[PDB]
Symmetry: D2
Subunit: 310 residues, 4 copies
């Protein structure tokens, strides 16, 4: 099976590196305006594959994305000195306007998996441009924050992460929501389970955890200039769900008819991911304050789509 990746900076290349080291697919195709950036990365990574799995990583054009069952969009541009947010956004919006049609031309039946930040808006942009059903365009969304939330929760409780069920919903960013209230451990309420043991989650712990989750990206960018390793592996996992038609549940961003009163916006909710993209939503119980933080996350996101016209 073939995976494509458009955009061969750190995020696209680390995604290819993850795909190869985990042996997710037999073929990975890097596509980038800078033909020879794509080539350098592809060849650097090919040097790694003998020490892991038989995986054919190459640089390529959109035509070489033929039969790709999933195409990662980590396209976009290197921000400029003094280039504002909204400015960079308009630029990436225009990159996608060129990327999406070309990808879908070579790989009509590919799920499009959007990585480019801000991921929720770029997801909505690629959805509108694709002219596809909304399930076929999936954004990586909050998956790393969700998993980080699970990890920190599992740690404090002393149980396996895979026993912890817990979400981060909404915008991938400042307004994301940690769903404390219907989080579970082995199928039962989490806060309550904690309590029945050593100590219930304290105010200090909750916000130490909230800060562990919420300001991770800021810490990373502050210290090294950008995040890419984390999302590389998260994208690989999603690619894996798509190629194997897993139908696992992931907090990914997609176009959603309505949420908490807000209409036609892309954001992360728990969704079932398979060979054709997201194929069902799993809406969990929310508390009134989580519900309200979500409406609010949706609206922020809706307004950012307005400013781009999508």
């Amino acid at each position: 099976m073939k995976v494509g990746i458009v955009g061969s900076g750190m995020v696209g290349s680390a995604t290819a590196y993850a795909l190869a080291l985990l042996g997710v697919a037999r073929e990975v195709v890097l596509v980038d305006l800078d033909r020879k950036l794509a080539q350098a990365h592809a060849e650097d990574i090919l040097h790694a594959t003998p020490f892991a799995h038989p995986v054919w990583v190459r640089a390529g054009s959109y035509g070489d994305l033929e039969g790709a069952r999933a195409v990662v969009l980590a396209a976009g541009v290197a921000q400029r000195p003094g280039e504002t947010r909204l400015q960079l956004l308009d630029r990436n919006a225009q990159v996608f306007a060129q990327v999406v049609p070309r990808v879908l031309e070579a790989a009509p039946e590919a799920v499009l998996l959007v990585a480019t930040n801000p991921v929720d808006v770029m997801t909505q942009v690629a959805y509108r441009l694709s002219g596809l059903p909304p399930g076929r365009v999936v954004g990586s969304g909050t998956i790393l924050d969700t998993a980080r939330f699970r990890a920190l929760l599992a740690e404090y409780l002393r149980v396996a992460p895979q026993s912890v069920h817990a979400y981060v919903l909404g915008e991938h960013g400042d307004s994301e929501v940690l769903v404390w209230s219907s989080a579970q451990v082995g199928g039962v309420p989490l806060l309550e389970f904690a309590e029945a043991r050593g100590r219930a989650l304290s105010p200090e712990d909750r916000a130490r955890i909230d800060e562990g989750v919420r300001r991770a990206a800021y810490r990373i960018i502050e210290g090294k200039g950008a995040t890419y390793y984390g999302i590389g592996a998260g994208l690989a996992r999603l690619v894996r769900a798509i190629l194997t038609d897993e139908k696992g549940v992931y907090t990914v961003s997609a176009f959603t008819p309505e949420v908490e009163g807000v209409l036609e916006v892309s954001l992360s909710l728990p969704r079932i991911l398979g060979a054709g993209g997201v194929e069902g939503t799993v809406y969990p119980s929310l508390s009134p304050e989580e519900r309200e933080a979500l409406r609010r996350s949706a609206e922020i996101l809706k307004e950012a789509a307005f400013a781009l016209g999508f």
Copy 2:
């Protein structure tokens, strides 16, 4: 790390095979009165290892269990039968713990809940240290069938089978989650409302599995072999994962000092916590009843 298995019949040797194929442990020691049987299974399995993982599978004595961090008891021979097996354990358990005072005991011998209770009493260890495979195959089969019906990955399905492993085990439909939401509410949102005949169909698939396998081939071993290996992995890696395994428990639904499957946290010291699911009146009554026959079976046997 070394794993021990006492009893080199089909269940024990299949566990060794699953351990080796999955690469769970670097060293696996099969111990059996019939030494030549243990050696033959060990060597057969050793020929497999170049095609999987570096795992030293061998036959040995009780003393070769020294330093083993988990030991599987698969040494099985009506409650006359159940009497013979308790006699065996009265030999096995002291000799395992002599060579390996640190080992978590993983009871596989039928009936597993009773034998888990007897292993416990004989051990003199704390209760978390003696763990019976219990209902893990049935719980997983229950999740598998539900996942298929719902068209969702089994890992998103949290459903339990609890109590006594066998005919009277309790499928806990009532509080089953999926994606963290109620099973039935999720089932409708997938356009597959669970029908009492669906519910009964699935029930049949879980409950009658072992009976079908025995009718066709005379014994079951492939499933529990892999299940025990997964359990051994949990112990060796101090996973603290949740598994519906049997352990001596102070009280279940009023019934005191009985061994049976509940959702339990499993790590390097054995089970170290219970995660008690929500039960409906029917299920609870079933469970308390299950707990009762087991309590007095153990009691008939002097345990």
Copy 3:
């Protein structure tokens, strides 16, 4: 991908088990005239799968082999009281006469993987009946013995097994040829490597090791009646090689035009195994002594097959 197995005894079922636990194919189909036996084994193994990899193991008919890319033939009958080896071979050759056309009817593109003993003659039988090119019919042959030879050499030299290249060739069994002369480690000749390692490999070490390889099957049969775990995993690896078009080198049995002058005979030589089965033979340097042992191994198989009618 789908793999079929005909014959659901201990060899066929242990093979299904190894395929499931190692996650080799998405679907495994066991076919046995004794349907309740096939069904019992498939369902026992299906219960293992939640603890390893998603694999659909099921019992079925020849018709259910359709689209299979490899079918393991572990078909056969139990020796009766006072029946000769050669009488048994008759009855088994007859089992293959029924099996082979039915398998090919339903999965005309499958590589056939023969496991039934004596594997070399049975490979010749499968090949003649199939009507297929020689590359399509492959016997497991001596892969277990070759693997053991290497493991023993490894442990003795203190070096990783994958660094040791030693072959067991010819007829699977007492007649097999351990190729000492051209065995190499790290590319260079075994016997100095041992030297420049502070292990000389007295003639007593080679005798120890020859007994280790040659007499394993006997020891196992004497202690438990049959072997199956070893070949179950050996076969699973051959299947993986076929499904991944690996073109790896294995000492497996195939119909060979000429070996040391003996014509049209099946036995193990080093062979390249890929999606179409064996696609090349690698002939290692042989010593006068080994060459004559191989020649002689070949002509006893040639006779036995012709005497059988193949």
Copy 4:
């Protein structure tokens, strides 16, 4: 087990990432002067681990290297550079062994062959304990291109690149083996004659790889990251596998006291054996000269 990585740039951080995704060690510790760079890379990678294996990646000081079996030195500093880096190693090496006295030192810093010699002198350890990545990438690429050309699994191709990592490295065509048989012979059997033209194409493919990668992206790190992770794994598992890595060598073709890549057996204590292949006159002579230039470079820098 714990692995240390000193130097948290792209090589050091790609290595930790490789180690994490492949699930090689349970603890990965990153050490860098720029504490925040190390912390950021570590936290970035920690976010990946839920989607691969349970691995604890973290920033730390030399003290946190306690009990590390292997420590990667990718501490080259941004640009006489030699001298510069030679000083770094004078600081780094003593600190590491203080925390991790059984630690094999794994030099990644370029030029890797001299640095491996540097690290060795300062080590005060047995020669095998200091191992430089050397030509492992080029050897693997050489095998990959040959496998591709001959239509055969890479695992079957036994071919080495030896000597100095870089433009004067030696492809050992003469004694290369596929499936145990001489290379050129196997090419025949395949009907895939290795002509001078084909060898030139393959040579360029191997020799000019890093050049091409530097030109398109500015630096190389993904490949060496996975190669180092494999070397680390060999060490942690006491594999005793054969790798073309750089190590201090008493004499090579008559040149004395020089560090360069030869096939070496790699285990828990570092390299514990050298496997010297047959060399054509051309190759032997090219290797001899390379070794000269290195032993000189080693001596002139003060090692």
